[PDB]
Write a protein that binds this DNA or RNA. Structure first.
Lengths: 102, 124, 58
DNA sequence: AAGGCCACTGGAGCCCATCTCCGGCAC
DNA sequence: TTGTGCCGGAGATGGGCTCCAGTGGCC
């Protein structure tokens, strides 16, 4: 599994909303608890030494692949820029509703 | 498949020689590996491997894929079969199988099958 | 005529499918780990990581 | 008896998607 | 900055994949 997909998995699971959630603005999301997110990624890939520093580098790696962009002026805020609509078959507002996004 | 750089690739297969040549040529011309990776749409790890191998070997050729090493056709077992045939050209494969055991060159697990013994006879 | 299974036995092939049932996020080496711990295969009968992925593809 | 036939194995090398270490730059 | 936060280069990893030498019942 790829990092961007893993985050999507977390973002479409209500029980994970205390550490990662949609901001409501399109496909923008926030790592409310960046360290919990890094820990789970480390567990999913069997990488005991994963940490936010490396997770963060992983996100920077997506910048020019036009998969994910980082929102300026804030910390822990990113935005999927690939066309999730086509992949998921859902619209942003539409998916947020299925997950009860404030 | 399509990698994250948008490049078409065949999982498990070597990058076509023509692309391999272009990677070496672009680096030769001064293009940064990260730029070669992005422009040709090849993972930087692959570009890194190809270039590293080229500076070290002079070749753009990928390694040899596939195959396996002998399991029963051990170097000693093979020489023993040859020694048996030289001693008695008419000895049969199953009789060879029996002498390999009777002399303990093989266990009931190591001993080559009749097919293998003849195959060994035929080839090496 | 070709050959018959030596490790991809119907029993091992069924357990692998069962392990993929519990959690598809398993790596090949992990299937080999449980397939070995639950004593479903002998350390000399356990499929290689390559076989396990071959079994999964088939 | 030996040879043709071929499903089955596992390790070889492959590219990918990171993992990891680290230098740059702005302040 | 003897630092913090963000960016991005490239050798190291190791996963599933295709390959294929090697093997062994069968006729």
């Amino acid at each position: 599994i790829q990092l961007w997909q893993f985050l999507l998995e977390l973002l479409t699971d209500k029980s994970c909303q205390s550490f990662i959630s949609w901001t409501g603005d399109g496909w923008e999301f926030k790592l409310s608890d960046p360290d919990e997110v890094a820990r789970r990624w480390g567990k999913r890939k069997n990488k005991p030494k994963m940490n936010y520093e490396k997770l963060s580098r992983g996100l920077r790696y997506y910048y020019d692949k036009n998969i994910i962009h980082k929102t300026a002026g804030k910390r822990y805020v990113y935005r999927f820029v690939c066309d999730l609509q086509s992949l998921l078959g859902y619209t942003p507002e539409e998916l947020h509703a299925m997950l009860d996004v404030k | 498949g399509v990698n994250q750089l948008g490049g078409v690739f065949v999982n498990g297969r070597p990058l076509p020689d023509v692309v391999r040549q272009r990677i070496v040529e672009l680096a030769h011309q001064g293009v940064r590996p990260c730029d070669i990776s992005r422009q040709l749409r090849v993972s930087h790890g692959c570009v890194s491997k190809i270039l590293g191998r080229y500076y070290e070997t002079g070749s753009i050729k990928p390694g040899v894929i596939g195959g396996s090493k002998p399991k029963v056709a051990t170097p000693k077992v093979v020489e023993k079969i040859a020694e048996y045939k030289r001693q008695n050209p008419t000895m049969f494969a199953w009789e060879i199988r029996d002498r390999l055991l009777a002399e303990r060159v093989c266990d009931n697990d190591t001993v080559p099958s009749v097919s293998s013994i003849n195959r060994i006879i035929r080839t090496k | 005529g070709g050959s018959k299974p030596k490790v991809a036995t119907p029993k091992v092939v069924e357990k692998i499918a069962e392990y993929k049932r519990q959690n598809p996020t398993m790596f090949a080496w992990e299937i080999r780990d449980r397939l070995l711990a639950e004593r479903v295969c002998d350390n000399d009968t356990v499929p290689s990581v390559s076989s396990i992925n071959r079994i999964i593809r088939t």
